[PDB]
Write an enzyme that holds these catalytic residues in place. Structure first.
Site, PDB file in Angstrom:
ATOM      1  N   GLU A   8       0.900  -1.476  -0.030  1.00  0.00           N
ATOM      2  CA  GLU A   8       0.066   0.029  -0.003  1.00  0.00           C
ATOM      3  C   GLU A   8       0.705   1.105   0.124  1.00  0.00           C
ATOM      4  O   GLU A   8       0.339   2.352  -0.391  1.00  0.00           O
ATOM      5  CB  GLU A   8      -0.953  -0.029   1.091  1.00  0.00           C
ATOM      6  CG  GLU A   8      -1.781  -1.079   1.360  1.00  0.00           C
ATOM      7  CD  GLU A   8      -1.198  -2.013   2.444  1.00  0.00           C
ATOM      8  OE1 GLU A   8       0.098  -2.445   2.331  1.00  0.00           O
ATOM      9  OE2 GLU A   8      -1.847  -2.484   3.539  1.00  0.00           O
ATOM     10  N   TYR A 296       2.451  -4.819  14.027  1.00  0.00           N
ATOM     11  CA  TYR A 296       1.261  -4.047  13.522  1.00  0.00           C
ATOM     12  C   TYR A 296       0.524  -3.221  14.588  1.00  0.00           C
ATOM     13  O   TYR A 296       0.252  -3.705  15.709  1.00  0.00           O
ATOM     14  CB  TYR A 296       0.261  -5.000  12.796  1.00  0.00           C
ATOM     15  CG  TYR A 296      -0.643  -4.322  12.192  1.00  0.00           C
ATOM     16  CD1 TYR A 296      -0.381  -3.367  11.086  1.00  0.00           C
ATOM     17  CD2 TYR A 296      -1.998  -4.733  12.154  1.00  0.00           C
ATOM     18  CE1 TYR A 296      -1.269  -2.592  10.455  1.00  0.00           C
ATOM     19  CE2 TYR A 296      -2.970  -4.370  11.434  1.00  0.00           C
ATOM     20  CZ  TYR A 296      -2.778  -3.125  10.427  1.00  0.00           C
ATOM     21  OH  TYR A 296      -3.691  -2.680   9.644  1.00  0.00           O
TER      22      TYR A 296
END
Length: 562
Positions: A8, A296
């Site tokens: 991304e 994350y």
């Protein structure tokens, strides 16, 4: 040819490139490639991009300036033997992967969806060792969320413009979060502080050491005068009383480190300790994550992998010693907590990270190391003194072993009561009465509202920050001095919505919808059916709301004058 790997952002692309051989071709899509725009009505459906009346058919479209990116992806795809979708692990990331596969085209067998909670050599290695398949259920759960939001936003807003004011917005969960702030505002406005007094006594031990005490009981009942008159009466008695040590309880106590961070607890700690708002915290966390420094940042799991625990125990052993290492690892309670990807990397060694991002890493690092260290040990003491019909107390504590607190900044404590034995007489030096007033409920901070949302099962790691951000630039609530204040329009809209959209504004029902989404993600429910039930109840609410108030419709935002 080689293999194509899609991510991304440029940052993720750079970091992952360090762990992918020459047989790979890394390319970032630079944000989303496709997305939605920006009884029935075509104009409404066209704007929404989804059609609630035609089984939720959607009309996604390539974002502005992305037309070029798609072409580049396709030409790269043709020269590639296989395609790896390496988006982040959450439902949003699964949906982004879906859009990529859907746009690039080709047979599904040509695609693989890799999952990793940190960008490191071993994590990337394992991630590509056994690449999984795109999970349609997770994609559907994410789209269901998007569709319900779009429906409430685009369908409730027009009602608000007519009934209340043009420009107003409506949010499925946003409205509920605002309700929380409004209820807190009204609690504070209606709060009446209650008066209560306390009496402390300065005494001297037989040796001559100072001993401070607070009056706890009178006639064997909790001591709490409500005015100056009652306290003076108590003081008069205490001035003439004989004081003596009634009992001394010396017991060992301990303090335990907290669990490693999760999204919500990180936001609260960063806010309370570093003064960082939720937006700053999550933006810096993302940068640290994409740079490969932490796991994350969207998670609600306090789990730590075996390797991570071994890594930190080795650090504790080498840098602090065996006394700081527990017999066995601490297990708090797939996903993982937010932690350093390499415990041997210090905040001072981070590259391309601003000062505040290094401060956040430090916060995360310290919490991670501490959670695997031994408890701090203290020797606590409680002295109970008798004085006529009064009972007084003194509390002290001496640190025996610092344990986990060793990794936290050194202390700038105060206590250590004097030596006294049962039966010892104390000489009264001075009595100090003090007036106090109960305080009103505390105001929400961005992070403490997130804490409240989580407690009620309303948010989600991937949406706490967006909820906090959205409710602000709408004129419903505002942040001042790092705290929330409900604005008048926030109360006006909240009352209207509670009156005409009770189910949508109900806390338990909103929490239940999050559960429904989880059911879709876990193949325990079907997304379009869940959406149909949602839309069915919603339209009922909406149809009645559009009616005149004399027939149960929404109340207009006005005051009719003679």
């Amino acid at each position: 040819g080689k293999a194509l790997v899609i991510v991304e952002s440029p940052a993720k692309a750079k970091t992952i490139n360090k762990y992918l051989g020459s047989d790979y071709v890394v390319k970032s899509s630079v944000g989303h490639i496709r997305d939605l725009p920006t009884d029935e009505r075509g104009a409404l459906v066209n704007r929404m991009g989804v059609d609630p009346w035609h089984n939720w058919e959607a009309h996604y479209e390539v974002l502005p300036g992305k037309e070029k990116v798609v072409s580049e992806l396709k030409q790269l795809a043709e020269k590639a033997d296989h395609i790896y979708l390496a988006t982040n692990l959450d439902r949003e990331g699964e949906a982004i992967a879906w859009h990529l596969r859907e746009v690039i085209g080709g047979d599904d067998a040509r695609y693989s969806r890799v999952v990793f909670n940190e960008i490191t050599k071993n994590a990337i290695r394992q991630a590509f060792n056994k690449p999984g398949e795109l999970n349609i259920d997770r994609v559907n759960a994410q789209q269901a969320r998007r569709f319900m939001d779009r429906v409430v936003g685009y369908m409730v807003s027009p009602l608000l413009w007519k009934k209340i004011a043009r420009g107003l917005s409506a949010g499925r969960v946003q409205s509920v979060a605002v309700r929380l702030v409004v209820e807190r505002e009204r609690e504070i406005k209606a709060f009446v502080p209650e008066e209560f007094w306390e009496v402390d006594a300065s005494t001297t031990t037989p040796s001559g050491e100072a001993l401070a005490l607070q009056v706890t009981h009178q006639n064997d009942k909790p001591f709490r005068p409500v005015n100056k008159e009652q306290t003076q009466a108590a003081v008069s008695l205490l001035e003439k009383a004989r004081y003596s040590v009634l009992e001394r309880e010396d017991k060992p106590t301990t303090s335990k480190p907290g669990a490693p961070f999760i999204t919500s607890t990180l936001q609260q700690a960063a806010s309370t300790r570093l003064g960082f708002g939720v937006k700053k915290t999550m933006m810096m966390a993302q940068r640290l994550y994409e740079a490969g420094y932490i796991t994350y940042m969207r998670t609600d799991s306090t789990n730590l992998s075996q390797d991570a625990v071994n890594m930190v125990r080795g650090y504790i052993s080498d840098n602090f010693g065996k006394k700081y290492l527990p017999e066995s690892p601490n297990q708090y309670a797939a996903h993982e907590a937010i932690r350093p990807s390499d415990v041997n990397v210090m905040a001072e060694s981070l590259k391309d990270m601003e000062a505040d991002a290094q401060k956040l890493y430090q916060l995360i690092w310290r919490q991670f190391v501490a959670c695997q260290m031994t408890p701090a040990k203290y020797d606590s003491t409680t002295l109970t003194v008798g004085a006529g019909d009064f009972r007084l107390k003194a509390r002290g504590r001496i640190l025996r072993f610092d344990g986990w607190t060793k990794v936290m900044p050194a202390l700038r404590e105060d206590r250590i009561l004097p030596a006294v034995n049962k039966g010892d007489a104390l000489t009264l030096v001075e009595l100090t009465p003090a007036q106090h007033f109960t305080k009103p409920p505390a105001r929400f901070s961005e992070a403490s509202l997130v804490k409240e949302l989580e407690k009620r099962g309303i948010g989600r790691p991937s949406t706490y920050a967006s909820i906090i951000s959205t409710i602000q630039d709408r004129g419903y609530v505002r942040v001042e001095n790092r705290r929330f204040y409900a604005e008048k329009m926030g109360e006006i809209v909240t009352d209207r919505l509670e009156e005409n959209f009770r189910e949508l504004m109900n806390y338990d029902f909103t929490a239940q919808m999050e559960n429904s989404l989880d059911q879709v993600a876990n193949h325990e429910a079907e997304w379009k059916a869940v959406l149909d039930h949602f839309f069915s109840d919603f339209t009922q609410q909406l149809d009645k709301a559009e009616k005149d108030p004399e027939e149960g419709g929404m109340r207009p935002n006005q005051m009719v004058l003679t």
